[PDB]
RNA sequence: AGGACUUUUACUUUGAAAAAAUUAGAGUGUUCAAAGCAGGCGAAAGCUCGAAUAUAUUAGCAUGGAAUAAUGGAAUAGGACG
RNA sequence: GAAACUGCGAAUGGCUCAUUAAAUCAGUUAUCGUUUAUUUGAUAGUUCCUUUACUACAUGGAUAUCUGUGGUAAUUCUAGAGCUAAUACAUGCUUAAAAUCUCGACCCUUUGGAAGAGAUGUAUUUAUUAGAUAAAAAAUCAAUGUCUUCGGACUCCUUGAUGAUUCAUAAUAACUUUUCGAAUCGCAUGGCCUUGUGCUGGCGAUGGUUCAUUCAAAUUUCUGCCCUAUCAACUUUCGAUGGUAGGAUAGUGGCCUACCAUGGUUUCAACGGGUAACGGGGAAUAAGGGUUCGAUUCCGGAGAGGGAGCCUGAGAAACGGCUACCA
């Protein structure tokens, strides 16, 4: 029953428009995901012209893409810490896109010790001469080595869990985390 | 309950579904020939731009 | 009317799926992508080497101009990255054979690549809904100053 | 209304099926097809109207039941089946085949034409895109979706469907100097040669048309269909050649050739 | 067919567009007419011309013109060219 | 060939003009801002996952119709029992090759280069990359690739469309309470002989993913509305104008939320009031200019006593569909 039509908003004039016709049902609006973490529950839900959406409410795990070397692993969300548009759903836990999350972060650990192999927080011939080629170029820069030793990666999701149903995002990193550190020492 | 024409029909099926792939990628070999041809002619007409000028 | 700061608001502000890898050693300013929205219309050096970001910019933003060209004057810079133009004309009543003054007030969406001010003559063009309002994005500021051009007198 | 519409009133009906606006309150509505309804023709308008053939609804529904009516080489048995532009209809009965062009009063004309030729059809590029899996595909008037074309076939351009396997045979590129057929508006079933296409940046091409009578006049792009070089018309054109002889003139014609 | 600059209009000619019905109007012995889009001609042995055109005066698009009416250049030269 | 299940339409058509004064509507645009049953044209080997143990010559259970027992005063009211089917509901099999990615039982001193192993269809979601292109030559360090007729040469690099795109499309990494990839029907039942129920085999009918096309549907740009100032300021705490992010939407959009800015219209008549106002194509009237009418044969819109709410579907806020309040 929640429209979105413009005829119930005054005009840009400010004049008070008249009812027109009775709201119609392509112009529906339904009621928000609000989505939580924990023991996954997607609800299917049939709109205009098929096409399954998926209501993602209590989702626990999701794909997170780390953009310098691209590569996307499953992990869980643990928590979120920081949401642009409203601190309630931070204050509740509440999931939604664009918010930020914090991430097991092991799967990221291990690839990166299989595909590097540089022990953070402080074999074949084949994976040597690999790692020689590689030749220590994974420099990444400090701030997520320091949240790999503390354990927890900082995640922005990306995906709609309202609409899609899934929780897909990617690691703040460069520039972004830091923007964002900022604004998490303005709330610590 | 198994019939021969239901076996028949199954085999339809699935000869239909071989000879259409085969003629898809016979397709798919052919343009790619085509393509080929069309640009071995025009780098020829680029080499013959490029000495003339 | 544009904050120092490129990004301001609470919300980080960048332009979407364009990444700038900081482990690459290039350490240029970053990866600005842009457009030009056609119709011979230039884009301009400030939003090609800008800094800001403008989700609605014709020239940087997902918006794109299709449709409706209006040429107006602007009659109302003071509202936030947005304009609000004057397109006069007139309407030929026949009963009189006779021409009627009118104007109306077009809402548009100027980016912080124009720097525009009350006066100056407007090219707009049309693109999808961006607000309640504004349906067209400023494209072009034909006339800067018009008579200002010329303001001292030192001979 | 709520949905699709299924009804279309006499009147409603385009003024190029000329029905008679007594003797019913309804017309045929064109079911969905390769052609716009606007601009296709059912073909019960076709074989009751046009042809005669028939007598009235009941006599056409019997005619395409017993598959004898043929649309480019397929059954089509039903009633209001979009026959457009250039398709071709053939009777197997009286062994007759028919090619659907405007004459030039702007009307879909009965155009008895050979069957040699009735084996091929003649169609206008409307896109050209790439498909899945990066395979290049182009779209024709009709909505037929000819897979793999050839490379450098662009839009507005006009194809030889063989219409019997469906594929490409040959192309007419578009450009100045060049036979063009009119498919919308004033100039329906005119037929002239392209002297100019002024380009108009931003929508809504338009070209400049001058035809053998060395009459001259501007369409829309959309509007035009390339058609053979001048002289060569790649098809059979109809009786007139679509030169548009004024009213005056028609009378003269009336006048001249005339035998009782 | 491409980069390049485009003073901007108002005005006016031409064209594309303004659904059919309606109005106008061409052809046609519905027995005349209102109408209708029919019909006509063979030897009677299938052969046929049709279903014409115009207007809509506003808004939009293209186009030729540059009188009439308005705006803009170079005055601190920060002007134009090489 | 009744009945019933299944499928499809029932959202078309028909009627009325109550509401509605930038609202509808008309002309003209846009969707590079979206959904689209159907019709038409194309469209998929991978469902194997360690393939040296499986139903693919066909997997399972219900269920109406029906047989019988009832109830209620009655309604297209149906509870209990017993069988039974599918293009209903569920599962699920083949099945190639090729190439590309990844991981290595070793050697032999570099130009390191190789036995071999797993995944890759499509669908969804997210990150990243390609998606070029105004024009002739260089040197140089840094890295290191082919051939070397051991000087060194590198000569060859493929790229569609629009006016414009993050477009079309392709590629990598992953993701999925893992969509589709025919366990379906009719007719004719030919050919090969591996002469057996063996191998193949035509014309259709229904389905079926995606992309187009069509019928469309939603929004959408400019301009145009009757009377009234005895309606001059109107709108914003409750969205009023804009910004950003999110939610919702099929999709853009204060459409809704959170936080900001204080904005938007107006003497070119906004806002308010009236309309015994649905808009238009048109009708009467006729020197020319006009005046009045247009509920109604066509196109749009709205409504089913007034109101709200919703299931099914591609399409309804449906009403000869349901839910509730009011009359
Ligand atoms: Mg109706
Ligand atoms: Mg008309
Ligand atoms: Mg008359
Ligand atoms: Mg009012
Ligand atoms: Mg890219
Ligand atoms: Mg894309
Ligand atoms: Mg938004
Ligand atoms: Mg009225
Ligand atoms: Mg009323
Ligand atoms: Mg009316
Ligand atoms: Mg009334
Ligand atoms: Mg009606
Ligand atoms: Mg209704
Ligand atoms: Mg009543
Ligand atoms: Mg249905
Ligand atoms: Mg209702
Ligand atoms: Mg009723
Ligand atoms: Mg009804
Ligand atoms: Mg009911």
Redesign the interface.
């Known amino acids: 029953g929640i429209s979105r039509d413009?005829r119930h908003?005054r005009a840009?004039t400010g004049a008070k428009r008249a009812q027109f016709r009775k709201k119609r049902k392509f112009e529906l609006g339904r009621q928000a995901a609000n989505t939580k973490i924990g023991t996954k529950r997607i609800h299917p839900v049939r709109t205009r012209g098929g096409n399954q959406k998926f209501r993602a409410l209590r989702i626990e795990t999701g794909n997170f893409s780390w953009?310098?070397?691209g590569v996307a692993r499953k992990t869980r969300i643990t928590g979120v810490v920081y949401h642009?548009?409203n601190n309630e759903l931070v204050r509740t836990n509440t999931l939604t896109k664009?918010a930020i999350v914090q991430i097991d972060a092991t799967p990221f650990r291990q690839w990166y010790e299989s595909h590097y192999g540089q022990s953070l927080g402080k074999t074949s011939k084949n994976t040597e001469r690999k790692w020689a080629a590689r030749a220590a170029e994974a420099?990444?820069?400090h701030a997520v080595d320091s949240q790999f030793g503390a354990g927890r990666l900082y995640a922005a999701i990306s995906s709609r869990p309202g609409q899609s149903g899934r929780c897909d995002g990617y690691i703040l990193?460069?520039?972004?985390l830091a923007?964002?550190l900022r604004?998490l020492t303005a709330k610590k | 309950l198994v019939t021969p024409q239901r076996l028949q029909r199954k085999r339809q099926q699935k000869s239909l579904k071989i000879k259409n792939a085969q003629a898809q990628r016979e397709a798919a070999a052919e343009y790619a020939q085509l393509l080929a041809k069309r640009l071995s002619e025009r780098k020829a007409e680029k080499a013959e731009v490029r000495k003339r000028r | 009317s544009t904050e120092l700061t490129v990004?301001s608001?609470?919300?980080?502000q960048?332009q979407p799926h364009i990444?700038?890898?900081?482990?690459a050693k290039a350490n240029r300013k970053t990866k600005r992508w842009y457009k030009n929205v056609?119709?011979?219309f230039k884009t301009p050096k400030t939003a090609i080497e800008g800094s800001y970001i403008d989700k609605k910019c014709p020239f940087t933003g997902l918006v794109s101009i299709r449709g409706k060209?209006l040429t107006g004057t602007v009659v109302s810079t003071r509202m936030h990255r947005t304009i609000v133009i004057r397109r006069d004309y007139l309407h030929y009543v026949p009963k009189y054979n006779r021409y009627e003054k009118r104007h109306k007030n077009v809402?548009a969406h100027v980016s912080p690549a124009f720097r525009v001010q009350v006066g100056d003559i407007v090219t707009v063009g049309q693109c999808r809904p961006i607000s309640?309002?504004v349906r067209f994005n400023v494209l072009k500021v034909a006339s800067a100053t018009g008579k200002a051009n010329k303001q001292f007198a030192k001979f | 209304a709520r949905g699709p519409k299924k009804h279309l009133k006499r009147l409603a009906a385009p003024h190029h099926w000329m029905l008679d606006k007594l003797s019913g309150c309804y017309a045929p509505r064109p079911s969905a097809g390769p052609h716009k309804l606007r601009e296709s023709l059912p073909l019960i308008v076709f074989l009751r109207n046009r042809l005669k053939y028939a007598l009235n609804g009941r006599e056409v529904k019997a005619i395409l039941m017993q598959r004898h009516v043929k649309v480019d080489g397929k059954v089509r048995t039903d009633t209001t089946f979009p026959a457009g532009f250039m398709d071709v209809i053939t009777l197997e009965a009286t062994n007759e085949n028919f090619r659907l062009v405007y004459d030039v009063k702007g009307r879909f004309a009965v155009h008895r034409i050979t069957d040699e030729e009735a084996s091929y059809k003649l169609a206008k590029v409307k896109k050209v895109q790439l498909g899945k899996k990066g395979i290049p595909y182009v779209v024709t008037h009709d909505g037929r979706t000819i897979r793999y074309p050839d490379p450098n076939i662009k839009v507005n351009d006009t194809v030889k469907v063989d219409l019997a396997t469906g594929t490409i045979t040959d192309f007419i590129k578009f450009d100045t100097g060049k036979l063009v057929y009119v498919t919308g508006g004033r100039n329906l079933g005119r037929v002239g040669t392209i002297v100019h296409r002024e380009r108009h940046?931003?929508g809504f091409d338009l070209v400049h048309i001058k035809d053998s009578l060395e009459n001259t006049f501007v369409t829309r792009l959309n509007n035009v269909f390339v058609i053979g070089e001048p002289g060569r018309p790649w098809i059979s054109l109809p009786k007139g050649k679509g030169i548009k002889l004024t009213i005056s003139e028609e009378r003269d014609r009336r006048r001249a050739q005339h035998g009782l």
């Open positions: 413009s908003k840009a953009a310098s070397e642009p548009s664009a420099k990444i820069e990193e460069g520039e972004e923007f964002y604004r | 990004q608001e609470r919300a980080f960048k990444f700038t890898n900081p482990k056609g119709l011979g060209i809402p309640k309002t | 940046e931003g």
